């Protein structure tokens, strides 16, 4: 009936299991069944937009759509108009480049049916000079977001106001996520005390920096695995 | 005529912004009405995308035809709500009319390079 | 965010090389209009024709590209950076990255010959 | 049954319709009685006993150079390198701690000793850049750098703040102690 | 003026034991002017510093 | 022609951001607005693709550097996704609680932190009390305070102490009435209630056009989690009721951060009566550490120990974008792998990144002052959305 | 109500005397309220540098991990037996409609059926060529639902709602949040 009379816990039987049995599983089963759901919805929208989607495809029910860069705008709005695909919310946007090929970046989206509990993801391709165009027709954040991946990458999004740049010193030039472009970028900064104001000096280390990536084997030690292709997606062999 | 889909002031629903449509079965199946009438005017019949949604209105209309209640026609729907639903199909009959002009139903204009979609294998 | 900023323009591509280049003129002539602004903004130490005589040899840099859409990145370049002089967003030291040249004489022994680059193992 | 299409079990759940919100004439109270507490300021004095009950409590501040708040075994702060018993360096240059330090705050070179046995030339943290990670103890087979839950040695030049091989053992010199008793209660759990 | 009334209403409370019963029905016919000068302002809201944030009270009218 | 148009902050306007902003008034009435960011920008992105996984997690606690346990969680998900691994049973539970405690934390720093903005002084230090002592249940389980180098993508960096699951226990007892105190002079409160009625309404389908999300989504009234709508980490297995606002106003988005510390206390409840027993690790050395007990007397964990922390360990090619319910908002990551152990690129979603973003659409024709109660309720805590 | 006011002797907070105690249940909003200090001979005694649960703590582990004598790795595997990217071609889509499926195949003929395979594997055919090639129960069959419907966008799982409205609700009415779950 007092705080000095109340009972510790500390002290008391806990539980106490010799040896916990927890059964092994591979953590891909709990997918399949929607997994293989998903693929009748991605065929049906191949057999939706035939002009625009260069294909599709499914790793672990992350659905990705494959577009054109002249070819944007007519499925957006179908993933947003359609009482069946009604995604409505931009997400986030981004680029991720591959230098190896001819076509250099590719231009990658992500949405979410918040009626429906979905998501869907849609690549395209875009070379730095050539432009993908911009989702702000529909999508009224995504300006702030294709003025993200603007700066980060150079590629644009054509029908766009307020295009500039955005979280990187105003008077820079490059940019910086590109295979190219070094780590520590060009120039750094100092106090100059002549001039009373600081200066934009080329770059100079104390440290050289050092990766260490150098160690790395040439076959990536990950196998083929297995697929989750669902029974009716693949190709009937003859006979 | 004209038709209002989504009375942006009057007595709140729980969706803000939204507000309590009123009368909104007749405006909703003349809404219907227009996209019966659009895809079947500048559609071809082979294409996916009027098979399906002259079939998906249809099934929609039938049961807003043939029901008048509130809180019984959505879960019938299955969707959200009700001026929710009108909402989205006020939003699917502009889609059809901006089908008509993108024509979907062809092939693909733009083939992809064939070095385009490999990743790491 | 349905509405833009002062000078920001939609970003829209000119089909021709006409088009461009009366886009670039029209440019090179709102840097020109806006540089006695900028002394002011800015508060820089030197005269406003040395401000027009960079803002013309930066594009006399540029004069010679033969390309539609390179030009065409090359002046969206050109307006953002147009955009932001024309407003507070870069600050003076930002400003003066612009002239290298201009607010120190180089320093003794700049390397012209072989032997001035060899004697330093070219800096 | 059937679904539409767009048409999931995400109905609308059972009563989402919200309410008709209350009118003038559809509220309980009088409002004489409402205007009590609007005039009278109810919801303001109750807030204000609430502070003065607070007044009349006890504070929780500690008096920092005579007390200290909680130090947990496993809190890091500056670093140490431990030695054997019977006084021997611990550390061999595994070079983990400069492979997974991710600010690359290590640095070692390290030779062949006049026994044989190998030990460290150099080993030089940059603690301008020591990000507390924390990796670099966890990375030590023989247990050789640690984290010495100090955090009380603020320089005032950069160059003081170079710590090198002589000040991590001198460091492990003074805090052995502590690391000691750190690590009885740690190296269950590591 | 309403600062000003209360330096008109200042020699009225230090006298206001000699205008007995009759003082008082000047000054109160005079705060009765002032009081619906004063209701005036508010029934035009003059100091509404009112917002042009309006949420589009006009609907949805399609086709 | 243009309004006499300012500078906000340079250094000190709203508590824990630089929010350089330029607003032009025509009244003290915000016609438009244009927040430059990039006053905080490290340019974290361009770091981690030259870093292992096992050294790019702590990336990401200086990411939201006020839940910093959600950012980590989202990581080590994401790469558990990626790798098809599962975290085992108890792992679940410990980080679901600490990415519960880490919410009382936000929202404990973040209510307090608008009501400093604002101006009320006492929950600013009623509250940070309460995030000492819980700086202190972070620093019994992991590294220091306030930057845990804790959920590896393996799991979990190690198990507890040996009696922190009850001395919470002796903590969540008081924290409800430390709570529903500060409640008592914020949530009637007619100075409040005033400013915080209908200011900055967010209707719905301009929410979803935002992209906006967390407890500004679920105060426009559309019911969204990701505890509930895609579960994980044992969500499912603890019960949770969820807040959802009725107008699109601040004061939603204010009640539905005092809503969830009731919430979360509850996740707490049913925490620590049921936390099982097993390994708090993945079950395997091949991603993660062995613990230093038998390494010191296998061979087979010494080379798994070493590769771990020089290579580190090898992910499968692929790409995913896992998001979770941050209390900020859904923050999301998108991670490109190589096949390499060091990831060829990744994004990050930051939650207050797109709330930035959708700030002039909601902040036009308000005022000044009020142009600052919309501030920290969409959490611009500026370490998120540049990065 | 599972969950509702508990009394202050259950709190774990330095509590009061008792003539003081007396004089703030008289002098207080609600009597069950901690004044926020946790008691000092309970919470974090013994300290964590000192625990005696501590000295014996081997490892956390499961029965089918560290069993020795049964499983190989390769059984307990998680690494290697990742899902493969499945990619899909706009061609292998006319493969799935014409060619069939490995459910209902439409290919006799296993010789020619590689060379009715091939062209289409080479672009013999188009997409919209094979929507009208399609019948109208292969389109009901496998592109929309057996009725004819589109499919509704999939959900891992599907998490219907309640309201809870009454006193168990978070807040009373008036207070505009609802807490839905
Ligand atoms: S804690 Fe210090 S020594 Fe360890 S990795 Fe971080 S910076 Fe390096
Ligand atoms: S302290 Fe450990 S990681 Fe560092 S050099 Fe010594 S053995 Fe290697």
């Given at each position: 009936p007092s705080w000095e009379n109340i009972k510790d816990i500390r002290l008391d039987p806990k539980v106490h299991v010799d040896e916990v049995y927890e059964p092994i599983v591979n953590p891909a089963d709990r997918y399949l069944q929607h997994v293989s759901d998903l693929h009748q919805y991605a065929k049906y929208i191949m057999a939706a937009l035939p002009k625009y989607i260069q294909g599709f495809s499914v790793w672990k029910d992350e659905l990705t759509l494959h577009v054109a860069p002249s070819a944007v705008i007519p499925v957006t709005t179908f993933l947003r108009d359609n009482t069946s695909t009604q995604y409505k919310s931009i997400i986030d946007i981004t680029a991720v480049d591959y230098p190896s090929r001819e076509n250099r970046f590719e231009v990658v989206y992500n949405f979410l049916s918040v009626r429906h509990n979905s998501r869907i993801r849609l690549k395209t391709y875009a070379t730095e000079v050539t432009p993908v165009p911009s989702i702000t027709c529909l999508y009224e954040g995504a300006n702030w977001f294709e003025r993200e991946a603007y700066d980060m990458y150079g590629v644009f999004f054509e029908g766009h106001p307020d295009l500039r740049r955005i979280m990187t010193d105003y008077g820079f030039e490059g940019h910086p996520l590109r295979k190219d472009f070094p780590l520590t970028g060009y120039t750094e900064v100092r106090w100059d005390e002549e001039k009373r104001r600081v200066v934009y000096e080329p770059l100079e280390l104390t440290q050289a920096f050092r990766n260490?990536?150098?160690?790395?084997?040439?076959?990536?030690?990950?196998?083929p695995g297995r697929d989750d292709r669902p029974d009716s997606f693949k190709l009937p062999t003859p006979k | 005529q004209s038709v209002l889909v989504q009375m942006r002031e009057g007595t709140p629903i729980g969706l803000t912004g939204i507000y309590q449509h009123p009368n909104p079965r007749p405006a909703l199946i003349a809404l219907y009405e227009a996209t019966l009438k659009e895809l079947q005017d500048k559609h071809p019949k082979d294409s996916v995308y009027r098979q399906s949604i002259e079939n998906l209105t249809a099934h929609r209309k039938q049961i807003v035809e043939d029901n008048e209640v509130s809180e019984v026609i959505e879960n019938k729907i299955g969707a959200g709500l009700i001026e929710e639903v009108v909402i989205q199909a006020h939003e699917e009959l502009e889609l059809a009319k901006k089908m008509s002009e993108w024509k979907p139903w062809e092939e693909l204009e733009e083939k992809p390079l064939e070095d385009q979609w490999v990743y790491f294998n | 965010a349905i509405i833009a900023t002062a000078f920001a323009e939609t970003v829209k591509f000119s089909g021709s090389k006409q088009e461009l280049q009366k886009r670039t003129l029209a440019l090179y002539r709102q840097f020109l209009r806006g540089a006695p602004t900028f002394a002011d903004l800015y508060e820089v130490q030197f005269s406003i024709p040395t401000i027009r005589t960079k803002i013309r040899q930066e594009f006399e840099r540029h004069r010679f590209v033969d390309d539609l859409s390179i030009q065409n990145v090359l002046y969206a370049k050109g307006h953002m950076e147009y955009q932001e002089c024309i407003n507070f967003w870069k600050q003076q030291a930002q400003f003066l990255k612009y002239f290298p040249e201009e607010d120190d004489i180089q320093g003794r022994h700049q390397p012209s010959n072989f032997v001035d680059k060899f004697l330093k193992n070219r800096a | 049954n059937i679904y539409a299409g767009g048409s999931a079990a995400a109905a609308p759940p059972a009563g989402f319709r919200i309410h008709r919100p209350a009118t003038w004439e559809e509220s309980e109270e009088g409002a004489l009685s409402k205007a009590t507490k609007y005039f009278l300021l109810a919801e303001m004095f109750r807030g204000l006993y609430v502070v003065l009950e607070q007044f009349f409590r006890a504070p929780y501040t500690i008096y920092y150079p005579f007390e200290k708040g909680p130090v947990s075994p496993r809190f890091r702060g500056e670093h140490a390198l431990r030695r054997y018993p019977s006084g021997e360096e611990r550390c061999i240059a595994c070079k983990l701690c400069e492979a997974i330090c991710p600010a690359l705050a290590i640095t070692i070179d390290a030779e062949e000793r006049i026994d044989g046995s190998r030990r460290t030339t150099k080993y030089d943290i940059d603690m301008t850049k020591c990000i507390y990670c924390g990796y670099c103890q966890e990375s030590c087979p023989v247990d050789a750098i640690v984290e010495t839950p100090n955090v009380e040695y603020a320089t005032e030049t950069r160059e003081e703040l170079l710590y090198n091989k002589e000040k991590l053992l001198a460091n492990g010199d003074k805090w052995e102690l502590e690391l000691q008793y750190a690590l009885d209660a740690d190296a269950p759990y590591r | 003026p309403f600062d000003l009334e209360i330096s008109t209403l200042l020699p009225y409370v230090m006298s206001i034991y000699l205008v007995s019963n009759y003082g008082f029905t000047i000054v109160l016919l005079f705060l009765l002017i002032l009081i619906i000068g004063f209701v005036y302002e508010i029934n035009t809201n003059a100091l509404k510093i009112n917002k042009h944030n309006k949420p589009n009270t006009d609907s949805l009218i399609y086709k | 022609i243009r309004a006499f148009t300012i500078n906000f902050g340079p250094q000190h306007p709203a508590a824990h951001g630089v929010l350089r902003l330029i607003l032009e008034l025509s009244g003290e009435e915000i016609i438009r607005s244009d927040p430059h960011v990039g006053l905080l920008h490290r340019g974290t992105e361009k770091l981690i693709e030259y870093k292992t996984y096992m050294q790019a997690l702590p990336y990401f606690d200086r990411l939201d550097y006020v839940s910093m346990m959600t950012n980590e969680q989202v990581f080590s998900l994401a790469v558990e996704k990626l790798l098809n691994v599962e975290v085992p049973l108890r792992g679940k539970y410990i980080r679901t609680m600490f990415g519960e405690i880490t919410r009382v934390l936000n929202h404990l720093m973040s209510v307090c932190s608008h009501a400093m903005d604002v101006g009320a002084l006492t929950p600013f230090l009623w509250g940070f009390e309460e995030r000492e002592k819980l700086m202190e249940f972070y620093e019994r389980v992991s590294g220091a305070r306030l930057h845990a180098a804790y959920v590896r993508p393996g799991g979990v960096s190690q198990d507890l102490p040996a009696g922190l699951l009850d001395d919470i226990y002796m903590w969540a007892t008081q924290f409800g009435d430390r709570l529903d105190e500060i409640e008592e002079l914020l949530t009637d409160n007619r100075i409040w209630k005033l400013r915080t009625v209908n200011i900055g309404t967010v209707t719905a389908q301009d929410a979803l056009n935002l992209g906006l999300s967390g407890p500004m989504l679920r105060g426009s009234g559309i019911p969204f989690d990701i505890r509930k709508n895609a579960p994980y980490d044992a969500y499912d297995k603890v019960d949770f009721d969820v807040p959802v606002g009725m107008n699109g106003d601040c004061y939603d988005r204010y009640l539905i951060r005092m809503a969830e510390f009731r919430q979360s206390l509850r996740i707490i409840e049913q925490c620590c009566n049921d936390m099982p027993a097993g390994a708090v690790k993945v079950e395997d050395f091949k991603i993660n550490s062995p613990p230093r007990n038998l390494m010191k007397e296998d061979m087979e964990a010494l080379i798994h120990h070493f590769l771990l922390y020089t290579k580190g360990y090898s992910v499968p090619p692929g790409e995913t974008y896992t998001a979770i319910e941050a209390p900020k908002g859904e923050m999301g990551v998108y991670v490109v792998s190589d096949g390499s152990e060091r990831p060829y690129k990744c994004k990050i979603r930051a939650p207050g990144f797109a709330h930035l973003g959708a700030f002039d659409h909601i902040a036009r024709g308000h005022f000044l002052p009020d142009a600052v109660a919309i501030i920290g309720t969409m959490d611009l805590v500026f370490g998120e959305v540049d990065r | 109500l599972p969950g509702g006011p508990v009394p202050?002797?259950?709190?774990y907070t330095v509590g009061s005397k008792g003539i003081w105690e007396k004089l703030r249940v008289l002098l207080a909003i609600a009597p069950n309220r901690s004044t926020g200090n946790p008691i000092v001979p309970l919470y974090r005694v013994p300290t964590p540098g000192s625990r005696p649960e501590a000295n014996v703590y081997q490892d956390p582990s499961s029965y089918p991990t560290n069993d020795i004598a049964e499983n190989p790795y390769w059984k307990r595997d998680h690494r290697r037996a990742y899902p493969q990217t499945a990619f899909f071609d706009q061609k292998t889509v006319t493969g799935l409609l014409e060619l069939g499926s490995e459910a209902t195949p439409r290919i006799a003929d296993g010789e020619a059926g590689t060379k009715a395979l091939a062209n289409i594997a080479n672009g013999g055919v188009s997409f919209t060529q094979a929507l009208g090639k399609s019948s109208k129960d292969v389109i009901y069959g496998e592109v929309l639902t057996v009725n004819g419907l589109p499919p509704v966008a999939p959900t891992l799982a599907p998490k219907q709602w309640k309201i809870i409205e009454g006193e168990a609700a978070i807040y009373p009415k008036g207070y505009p949040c609802r807490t839905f779950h």
């Open positions: 260490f990536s150098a160690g790395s084997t040439a076959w990536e030690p990950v196998g | - | - | - | - | - | 202050v002797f259950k709190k």
